């Protein structure tokens, strides 16, 4: 499941939360996957997909807003875009 794979990742592998952190990771080549919240502004979505397309990086569309995505990564605040830096223990990169 998508939720447990994030939960396995959330505690084993390092990552960045939010927009500005995601962009620098996408810029510097550190990212290997990003997750996009459902209700994110579509102009913000297009700029992330452009860097991902311009750095050969995968993109995932979570079926939920910034509310659930923050809870899905085990935080009490809202997360719009998250860029994983390494899986660590899970198999999110090899799947989907």
Partner 1 sequence: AKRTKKVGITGKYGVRYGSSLRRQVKKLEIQQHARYDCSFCGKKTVKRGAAGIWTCSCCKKTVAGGAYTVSTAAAATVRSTIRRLREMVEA
Partner RNA sequence: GGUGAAAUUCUUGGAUUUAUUGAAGACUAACUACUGCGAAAGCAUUUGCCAAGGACGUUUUCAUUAAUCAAGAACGAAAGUUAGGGGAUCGAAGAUGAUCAGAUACCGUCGUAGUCUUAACCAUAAACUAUGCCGACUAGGGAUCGGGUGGUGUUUUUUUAAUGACCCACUCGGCACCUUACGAGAAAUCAAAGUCUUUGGGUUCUGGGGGGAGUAUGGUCGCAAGGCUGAAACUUAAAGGAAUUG
Between strands 81-84 and 33-36, the pairing is: antiparallel
- Residue 83 touching partner 1 (CB under 8 A): no
Q: According to CB under 8 A, which one of 58, 65, 85, 93 is a site residue for partner 1?
A: 65
What is the distance of C-alpha 40 from the center of its chain?
12
CB contact set of 25 (below 8 Å; sequence gap of 6+): 16, 31, 83, 85
- Residue 95 touching RNA (CB under 7 A): no
- Residue 3 touching RNA (CB under 7 A): yes
Contacts with partner 1 by CB under 8 A lie at 37, 39, 41, 65-67, 78
């Amino acid at each position: 499941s998508i939720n447990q794979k994030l939960a396995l990742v959330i505690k084993s592998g390092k990552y960045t939360l939010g927009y500005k952190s995601t962009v620098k990771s996408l810029r510097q080549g550190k990212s290997k996957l990003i997750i996009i919240a459902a209700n994110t502004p579509v102009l913000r979505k297009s700029e992330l997909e452009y860097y991902a397309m311009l750095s050969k990086t995968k993109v995932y569309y979570f079926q939920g807003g910034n509310n659930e995505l923050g809870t899905a990564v085990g935080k009490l605040f809202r997360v719009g875009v998250v860029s994983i830096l390494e899986a660590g223990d899970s198999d999110i990169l090899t799947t989907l």
